[PDB]
A paper describes a structure:
Furthermore, we performed focused 3D refinement to obtain receptor densities at a resolution of 3.6 Å. Receptor density was assessed in the ETBR–DNGi1 complex after adjusting the alignment center to the receptor. The mode of ET-1 binding in the ETBR–Gi complex closely resembled that of the crystal structure of ET-1-bound ETBR. Y13ET-1 and F14ET-1 in the helical region of ET-1 played a pivotal role in the compact assembly of the N-terminal tail and the extracellular side of TM7, initiating helical rearrangements of ETBR. The C-terminal side chain of W21ET-1 directly interacted with W3366.48 in the CWxP motif. Interactions between ET-1 and ETBR, both in the transmembrane region surrounding the C-terminal region of ET-1 and close to the extracellular side, played a role in ETBR activation. These ligand–receptor interactions influenced the helical rearrangement of ETBR through the conserved V1893.40P2855.50F3326.44 motif, resulting in an inward rotation of R1993.50 and Y2935.58, an outward movement of the cytoplasmic side of TM6, and crevice formation on the cytoplasmic side of the receptor to accommodate Gαi. A simultaneous downward displacement (~ 1.5 Å) at the NPxxL motif (N3827.49, P3837.50, and L3867.53 in ETBR instead of Y7.53) was observed in the ET-1–ETBR–Gi complex. N3827.49 extended toward R1993.50, and L3867.53 formed a hydrophobic interaction with I1402.43 to stabilize the helical contacts between TM2 and TM7.
Endothelin type B receptor (ETBR) plays a crucial role in regulating blood pressure and humoral homeostasis, making it an important therapeutic target for related diseases. ETBR activation by the endogenous peptide hormones endothelin (ET)−1–3 stimulates several signaling pathways, including Gs, Gi/o, Gq/11, G12/13, and β-arrestin. In this study, we present the cryo-EM structure of the ETBR–Gi complex, complemented by MD simulations and functional studies. These investigations reveal an unusual movement of TM7 to the intracellular side during ETBR activation and the essential roles of the diverse NPxxL motif in stabilizing the active conformation of ETBR and organizing the assembly of the binding pocket for the α5 helix of Gi protein.
Numbering used by the authors:
A (entry chain L): 1 to 21
B (entry chain R): 90 to 128, 133 to 206, 215 to 301, 318 to 399
Amino acid sequence: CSCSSLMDKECVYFCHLDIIW
Amino acid sequence: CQGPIEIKETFKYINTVVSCLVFVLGIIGNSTLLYIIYKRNGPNILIASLALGDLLHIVIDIPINVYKLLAEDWPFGAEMCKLVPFIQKASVGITVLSLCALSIDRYRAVASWPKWTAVEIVLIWVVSVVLAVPEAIGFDIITMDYKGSYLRICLLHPVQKTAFMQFYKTAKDWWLFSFYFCLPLAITAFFYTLMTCEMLRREVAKTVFCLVLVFALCWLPLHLSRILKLTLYNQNDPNRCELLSFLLVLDYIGINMASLNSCINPIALYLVSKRFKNAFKS
């Protein structure tokens, strides 16, 4: 998990659904 | 994008069963290996360490990951989120370092026909936590207000206090890939190749080479998925969501057969050595 910013609602959702790694 | 960023129902149906099966097989296999070891030389100590760290890796990886499919909400605490990735990375580190130590030991067994093994195992178990420490201070739950739900993502925060943590998070995927795939795989392959050259019998050579190939093949997809997410994710292409969706698919598959590599070590001992064959036999 790593996102450029906390304003785009796509990366954060992806890390919500991703695995813990 | 359109917003089809979701996990397929068929994917959940297959993956729950597959993950449960590999989890149970791993726990029974590694527990039996540890019990047999308990009931004494450097190879035995290293195999015991590999089995113990393997059990830790499965019990810290499979349960929460398979919980992430049914609920995908993370109702746990902030400290648990801050801690679990650290333990997972430590387990991976000790696993790969134990594989490295085992390869070196098997080379020296045929090339140069326990205190040193203990001082080389304490070094492994401290180096792993030393290198996994940065993971423990990065993860943090943040509740982002999605357009329709109140998320609780436990992620690596893009904005954090320490500057070194930002510098590391810049290339976390690269460093992880390097240290946990390239170094152990390359060192194991080099040591086993020199070992086989010194010996030449062929059964042991094919055994060690097949073990190395199995390790590489079963550990590649996680690093591949992380690298793809790092380098192939863009900002102004409508396909991004689909790619991300596909990433999730690949990512989960990795973790599954990542644990498969975990359980390949006990089976490899059952299929090769007569002593362990008899040990597991009854």
